[PDB]
Design a protein around this ligand. Structure first.
Ligand code: RM9
Ligand code: CL
Ligand code: CL
Length: 267
């Protein structure tokens, strides 16, 4: 009833913007869930940089990488949208600072360096997600080519559900020890690109961590979040969208509204 209506709201919302919306929301207290197109495929865009930061932390934790290790790149042609790597280029950044920049500012340079040097490229990225029991997620290509978001292209996609479950595992589950879990949570919390998405759908006094993607093509944008309400168990939210025509612009407000809806459905 509280779910059959939630779905109606989402279908109307996708029709409204001539597009396609995928949702998965978990209440980790009640075990309640809500889902619309949650097993349909959607492009990741930048949103996997959230999971890359987690992969770095797992390595870090196995004492295969030092979080404080200097990463040099003074002679690199930094990819477009590297706002943070660009500033430190003359001096390198720690591994920690590089991963968090991948997450928090969606920095392409940080992303690519980490995938090449420490994680085994996209295949390694996909392996890491398998290692935690995510079967849907796939990363095929690098920045920025992975952002094409061409309809029916399965490269570099996942499902809203697979994304949610995964976030749950990494942010709230037992893939990371207490120390590194806390860093991960902090990183998520300090994401700077998500104020118009899932965060705009919740009271100001809930803490949120999130990772957004914006493919910049076929109106494809997304956001995922861990939400900690005041007197309540953490929520997980997962919003994925595409649009019909290559030129369609992405809709921040549609993501926020889909977040409003999902949250009400698991409440
Ligand atoms: B990406 O998918 O992430 C991204 C880009 C541009 C602007 C954005 F706001 C964001 C985001 O939301 O993470 C480009 C780098 C790709
Ligand atoms: Cl970001
Ligand atoms: Cl964890």
């Amino acid at each position: 009833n509280k779910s059959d209506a939630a779905a109606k709201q989402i279908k109307k919302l996708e029709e409204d913007f001539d597009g396609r919306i995928g949702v998965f929301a978990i209440d980790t207290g009640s075990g309640n869930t809500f889902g619309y197109r949650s097993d349909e495929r959607f492009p990741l865009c930048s949103s996997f940089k959230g999971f890359l930061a987690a992969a770095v932390l797992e390595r870090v934790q196995q004492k295969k990488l030092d979080i404080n290790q200097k990463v040099k790149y003074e002679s690199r042609d930094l990819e477009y949208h590297s706002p943070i790597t660009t500033k430190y280029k003359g001096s390198g950044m720690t591994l920690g600072d590089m991963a968090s920049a991948a997450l928090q500012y969606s920095d392409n340079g940080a992303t690519n360096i980490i995938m090449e040097r420490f994680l085994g490229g996209p295949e390694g990225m996909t392996k890491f997600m398998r290692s935690i029991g995510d079967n849907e997620f796939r990363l095929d290509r690098w920045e920025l080519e992975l952002n094409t978001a061409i309809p029916g292209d399965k490269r570099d996609t996942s499902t809203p559900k697979a994304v949610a479950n995964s976030l749950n595992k990494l942010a709230l589950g037992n893939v990371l020890n207490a120390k590194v879990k806390a860093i991960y949570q902090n990183w998520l919390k300090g994401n700077t690109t998500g104020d118009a998405r899932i965060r705009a759908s919740v009271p100001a006094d809930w803490v949120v961590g999130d990772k957004t993607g914006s493919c910049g093509a076929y109106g494809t944008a997304n956001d995922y979040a861990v939400i900690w309400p005041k007197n309540r168990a953490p929520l997980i939210v997962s919003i994925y969208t595409t649009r019909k025509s290559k030129d369609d612009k992405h809709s921040d407000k549609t993501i926020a509204e889909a977040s409003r809806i999902a949250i009400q459905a698991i409440d």
